[PDB]
């Protein structure tokens, strides 16, 4: 592997530079939304975001070192977790709201427009609040997002050894960032723990959301795009 020899700063730089762009939702001032329109906008955005997520993944140190099959497995397992932590991240500047896109900022009330969606919105809003309360930095966020990509499907998969090594490198990078920021040794492991525990919550939101998406698919309030369907089916039939 080539990522195994990268320094902490080198790791952070690579991650920040691989960041995918912030996409826009279909323009339309028509409010409020209907269940179908909201579902259509959210799934259309996600499908487009998935394309950029795949390119981002390729730029995460160590990912291309894996076989295509392994790459496929990791992305199929973590795709919603990655979209969610990204959503939560850009929503930090908008307490009480979820910034799906710059022209698509929604509040919990609007989540009610789709049956079962408000519960997911509440979990997402709570996580964004936690990030804000912790004052999560962008450099920490990119490390966390890469950890999700490499960890989530790591067991349900030689290659695990490589991934575990890259995973350790990111941990080293997180502690480095915290030390550099002036945190004591104790504040460092305490914060590292706090950060990693949130990944358990992100996994939870992903499973609840996956169940909901599949349920909405069956109710067929709107057709789903092919890439998104592919990613969804990886978890279901």
């Amino acid at each position: 592997s080539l990522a195994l020899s990268l320094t902490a700063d080198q790791m952070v730089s690579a991650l920040l530079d691989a960041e995918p762009p912030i996409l826009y939702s279909e323009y339309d001032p028509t409010r409020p939304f209907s269940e179908a329109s909201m579902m259509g906008l959210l799934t259309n955005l996600a499908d487009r975001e998935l394309v950029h997520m795949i390119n981002w993944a390729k730029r995460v140190p160590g990912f291309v070192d894996l076989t295509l099959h392994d790459q496929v497995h990791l992305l199929e397992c973590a795709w919603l977790e990655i979209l969610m932590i990204g959503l939560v991240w850009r929503s930090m500047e908008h307490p009480g709201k979820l910034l799906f896109a710059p022209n698509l900022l929604l509040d919990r009330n609007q989540g009610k427009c789709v049956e079962g969606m408000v519960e997911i919105f509440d979990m997402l809003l709570a996580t964004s609040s936690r990030f804000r309360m912790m004052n999560l930095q962008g450099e920490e966020f990119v490390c966390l997002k890469s950890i999700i990509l490499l960890n989530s499907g790591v067991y349900t998969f030689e290659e695990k050894d490589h991934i575990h090594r890259v995973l350790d490198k990111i941990t080293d990078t997180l502690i480095h960032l915290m030390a550099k920021a002036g945190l004591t040794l104790q504040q460092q492991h305490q914060r590292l723990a706090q950060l990693l525990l949130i990944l358990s919550h992100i996994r939870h939101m992903s499973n609840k959301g996956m169940e909901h998406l599949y349920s909405m698919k069956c109710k067929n309030v709107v057709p789903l795009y092919d890439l998104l369907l592919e990613m969804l089916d990886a978890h279901r039939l």
Partner: peptide
């Protein structure tokens, strides 16, 4: 099998 994900990952 054929996956759009495969194509995008192989670009």
């Amino acid at each position: 099998k054929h996956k759009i994900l495969h194509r995008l990952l192989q670009d």
